[PDB]
Amino acid sequence: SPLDQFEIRTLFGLQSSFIDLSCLNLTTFSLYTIIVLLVITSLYTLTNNNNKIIGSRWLISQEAIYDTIMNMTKGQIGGKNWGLYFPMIFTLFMFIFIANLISMIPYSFALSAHLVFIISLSIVIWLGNTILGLYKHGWVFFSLFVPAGTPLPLVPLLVIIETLSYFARAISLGLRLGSNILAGHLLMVILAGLTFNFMLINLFTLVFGFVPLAMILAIMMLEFAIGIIQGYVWAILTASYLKDAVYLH
């Protein structure tokens, strides 16, 4: 069982017999959400030395993240009011960016590799695009489903397999991230499990047994890239989707 690293264990506990209060209780998932919140709080509270203008070396990091997500959501929705949807496009980044660096620490735990939470967050953003689009643009919201000047005898086909791609968008956006984080962690644990039993046979294998160690180091080098790039790709697709929902093509 190489997948035991994702087990959810209850720690602080709470129960009753009147009402099902077992929904909220401090758990491994919940404790790592508390840790994510305290890290994100720590990146801005004690980072700023006594509210100085000059912005010490720690604040350049949270300066660059801010600027690379402003200049990304200005180039996507880019209309009359792009900044009204900027806090959500930033707080969808920082959760995924911090929750995929915390998960790299060896005896730790991936928030992002729970499909039930990430798929739920994706369905929340998809319904919050459809409701916002219907509210802002009435019955002509469905004009999104015809591409451009197209010949009329093939328009209903191009409507059906446009709407099918419109509600595949509900689960695709989440399952991309879930699949990347889950496959990366499962790859690292399985190769560690193979190189461990590689190094317990006869003593000639601990000699020149440095090359599988170097391969695992190279995969860990790759895994930060595949963890930060997904945190960026989430925040670019849910900027493009707000471009479609707010502005009709």
Binding site: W139, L152, V155, I160, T163
Partner: peptide, 24 residues
């Protein structure tokens, strides 16, 4: 901005196909 049978130019046509496949 289509023109079906020289009638009034239809709105976007997208709702009617969904309504046809809805009742099935």
């Amino acid at each position: 901005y289509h023109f079906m049978g020289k009638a009034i130019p239809p709105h976007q046509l997208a709702i009617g196909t969904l309504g046809l496949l809805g009742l099935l």
